[PDB]
Design a protein around this ligand. Structure first.
Ligand SMILES: O=P(O)(O)C(O)(C[n+]1cccc(F)c1)P(=O)(O)O
Ligand SMILES: O=P(O)(O)C(O)(C[n+]1cccc(F)c1)P(=O)(O)O
Ligand SMILES: [Mg+2]
Ligand SMILES: [Mg+2]
Ligand SMILES: [Mg+2]
Ligand SMILES: [Mg+2]
Ligand SMILES: [Mg+2]
Ligand SMILES: [Mg+2]
Lengths: 358, 358
């Protein structure tokens, strides 16, 4: 049911956008077709957990003829897509920024045969503009419009900030200067857990966990009924854990099931495995690491992979995962004391995160 | 005076943004410094014609206690930067897409020594987010906020759509197909004045001419008082002429004066010169053009340039300019009948456009 309704609204959104382009932007059939393909390829294919959560959080707060339910649930699907389209935008640019080859089993958007990298960058921009176009089209008369968009934009902004932290993590920040070049850090002094948590919090936690919950509460007109301090704590913790899983899979999950080929080591990324490894590594391990990380060379990539394996990072992950699970639990219980319906929707989201396989 | 207050609000905006990142986003001194230079380099240096126009329309509508003048002009300055920051965002991305080397007399942002292309793409995104961040910070209580941002976003969108038309103009659209590679057109059957006008109208006209006048009308609470049909007519006319000038300057203006090195011929762009030349050229002239256009080779490039001068595009430009000057004149009078103060500001705006040199 959730997915069926969500997809019906997707076509409704697509039709509005595509036809408006034809009618008011003087767009030809060829480019409309291109944009329809671009939209489907960049927005469809995932598990839609960010978008579906909005619908689930909205439906579950429906208690605080059917008219209302129909409006609230449809507003929820629109918001769900706003987030899915926002993500799509970031993913298109991110793939370019991370030099990835595939995503969701297919080539990254900018690696498609008839898609130039220069056009891909702009298509990414179109994806984000669409979030605002659909928002105005469906919510122009809603009282929550301003607060809704004010929050959406702040999260958009925090994600861009996190991406800044992500792409500048392997460069000595003390030497960060637009006018003078510098190579990848060679002492990796900044690959610390503190720095890692900051990167992940802003680039993933906010738009992946907090925004779906907040938008769900807003279209449900129940925002004030929840402890926001606890909700944010929960979103931040679940968000970090999700990126950790993302980092681990990048290195150890086969691309067949992952749907995307990892580039974290190649890109010398400040991943969870890298910081956790470096924090426990002996002097010998650190030396060998430094001499193999950040290279495309296949053997040096398998050597970094072996190190992690030898330093029992898989064991470290299990420990961490268990510590997260207990905090989430104590936090959801705190939520439940005043927001039983909301806390249950949160449990569901957790169920889609805990030990996810993809 | 207009230029002194405009820069004053710039410091007020930079301060708010950078300090918020430190306080609320946990940003370090090194990255805050990096972003300060990013903001200065990408947002300062131009003519500020877009931003200054808002201030001038605003001031010229004040008549049709003294604190109101203060408030209205300050809101006008903020709106000016929203546009200037919007443009900064598109220019950062555009330079990467156009593979440009310099802008405003220095390396394009993605060309700065310690600015990687990957971070440059994201820095572009930050610039856009800041337009919304500053707008929320200054206009949170204004009744015009929704309407202001609704128009702003619409124009942001038209630019992106125009950029799509610009970057896919050298590829036979009938074969535009994400999954299939294709080379730059060889028949150039699509390099038509018809297609050229669409590109320019959307990538330049809206954000360069309409938006300034529109935001000016809004902060002075006078949008209703004007004939929008005539207003859009003017903005589109001046906008197209503005881009034609940008196209001509790209090929004939010395980089020392222009501030950037032309890339249109090399990028095989659907420029005013290209379409104009092709529409009047003999079969021999078209052949030569086809064997020299869209090549980095300075000699072939030199040939395209010679083809243009010999076809006397210099003369068509002058005839075009005079026809544009004529129309603008007539529309400005039609505007003057019921909106004299606004028509005056539009006159001033045209005066910064007609035969500009830069
Ligand atoms: O699975 P990936 O590699 O696409 C990723 O999770 C995408 N991504 C995640 C968060 C924000 C973003 F803009 C983009 P990563 O961060 O590049 O590892
Ligand atoms: O002088 P340039 O080359 O920076 C240009 O006018 C910029 N520009 C103009 C309009 C929209 C845009 F996104 C970017 P062009 O169009 O690339 O020739
Ligand atoms: Mg990334
Ligand atoms: Mg990535
Ligand atoms: Mg990843
Ligand atoms: Mg350009
Ligand atoms: Mg361009
Ligand atoms: Mg140009």
């Amino acid at each position: 049911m959730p997915m069926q309704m969500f997809m019906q609204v997707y076509d409704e959104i697509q039709m509005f956008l595509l036809e408006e382009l034809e009618l008011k932007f003087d767009m030809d059939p060829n480019r409309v077709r291109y944009l329809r393909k671009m939209m489907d390829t960049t927005c469809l294919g995932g598990k839609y957990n960010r978008g579906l959560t909005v619908i689930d959080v909205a439906e579950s707060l429906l208690s605080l003829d059917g008219a209302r339910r129909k409006r609230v649930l449809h507003d929820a699907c629109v918001c769900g897509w706003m987030i899915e389209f926002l993500q799509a935008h970031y993913l298109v640019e991110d793939d370019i920024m991370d030099n990835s080859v595939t995503r969701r089993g297919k080539p990254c958007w900018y690696r498609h045969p008839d898609v130039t990298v220069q056009c891909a960058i702009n298509d990414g921009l179109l994806l984000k503009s669409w979030t605002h176009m659909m928002a105005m089209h469906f919510f122009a008369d809603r009282p929550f419009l301003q607060d809704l968009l004010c929050r959406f934009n702040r999260v958009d902004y925090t994600t861009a900030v996190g991406q800044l932290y992500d792409v500048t993590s392997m460069f000595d920040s003390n030497k960060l200067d637009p006018d003078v070049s510098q190579p990848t850090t060679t002492d990796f002094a900044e690959f610390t857990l503190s720095n890692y948590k900051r990167i992940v919090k802003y680039k993933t936690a906010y738009y992946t966990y907090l925004l779906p919950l907040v938008m769900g509460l807003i279209v449900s007109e129940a925002l004030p009924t929840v402890d926001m301090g606890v909700t944010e704590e929960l979103a931040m913790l679940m968000g970090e854990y999700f990126q950790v899983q993302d980092d681990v899979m990048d290195c150890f999950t086969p691309p067949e099931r992952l749907g995307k080929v990892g580039t974290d080591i190649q890109d010398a990324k400040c991943s969870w495995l890298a910081v956790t490894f470096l924090a426990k590594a002996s002097s010998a391990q650190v030396a060998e690491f430094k001499a193999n990380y950040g290279s495309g060379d296949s053997e040096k990539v398998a050597t970094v992979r072996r190190l992690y394996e030898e330093a029992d990072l898989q064991g470290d992950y299990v420990a961490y995962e268990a510590a997260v699970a207990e905090q989430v639990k104590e936090l959801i219980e705190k939520l439940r004391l005043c927001s039983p319906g909301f806390a249950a929707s949160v449990e569901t989201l957790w169920g889609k995160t805990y030990k996810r396989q993809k």
